[PDB]
C-alpha cells in the first residue's frame, strides 16, 4: 500500500485509482470464481467467468495491449504495472537523475 497512496481529493473519499481499481476487479472476480466452482456450476457460466478473470489479469498487467479500461467520467486508459515502467512517465524515466 505504501507504493499506492490513498491521495484523498475531497477528504471524504480516498478514491484510490489506477493502482487499486484493477486489484479490486481481480479480487472480486476471483472470489466469485472460487465460491462458484464449489457449487457445481454449469460449464457455460464458469468458462465465461474464467474468461473475464483472464482478461482482467491481462488488463492489470498490460491494458494498452489488450482491452481498454477507463476511469469514472474519464476515457483515458489506466496505468498498469507495466505502464509505470515504460514510456516517458515510467520508473526508468526520472531514474536517469530526473
Amino acid at each position: 500500500p505504501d507504493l499506492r497512496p490513498l491521495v484523498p481529493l475531497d477528504g471524504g473519499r480516498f478514491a484510490t485509482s489506477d493502482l487499486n481499481d484493477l486489484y479490486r476487479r481481480v479480487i472480486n472476480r476471483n472470489n466469485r470464481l472460487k465460491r462458484l466452482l464449489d457449487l457445481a456450476a454449469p460449464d457455460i457460466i464458469v468458462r465465461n467467468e474464467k474468461r473475464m478473470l483472464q482478461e482482467a489479469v491481462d488488463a492489470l498487467l498490460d491494458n494498452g495491449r489488450r482491452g481498454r479500461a477507463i476511469t469514472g467520467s474519464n476515457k483515458r486508459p489506466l496505468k498498469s504495472l507495466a505502464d509505470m515502467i515504460k514510456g516517458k512517465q515510467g520508473r526508468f524515466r526520472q531514474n536517469l537523475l530526473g
Binding site: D2, L6, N20, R24
Partner: protein, 49 residues
C-alpha cells in the same frame, strides 16, 4: 485497516506507530512479539513499504 483485504492489518506490516490495531501491546517494550486478539508484528512503519 480492513480485515483480510487491501490496506489491512496482519498483512503488509504494522500501522503508523508500534501500537497494535486492537489496542494492546502498544509500546517499544514490545519489539518482536505478536498479540493474540490481533496478529501484528510490533515494528517500525517503514517496513510497511
Amino acid at each position: 485497516p480492513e480485515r483480510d483485504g487491501l490496506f489491512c492489518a496482519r498483512i503488509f506490516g504494522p500501522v503508523k506507530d508500534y501500537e497494535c490495531l486492537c489496542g494492546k501491546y502498544k509500546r517499544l517494550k514490545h519489539r518482536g512479539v505478536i498479540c493474540e486478539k490481533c496478529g501484528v508484528e510490533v515494528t517500525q512503519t517503514k517496513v510497511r513499504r
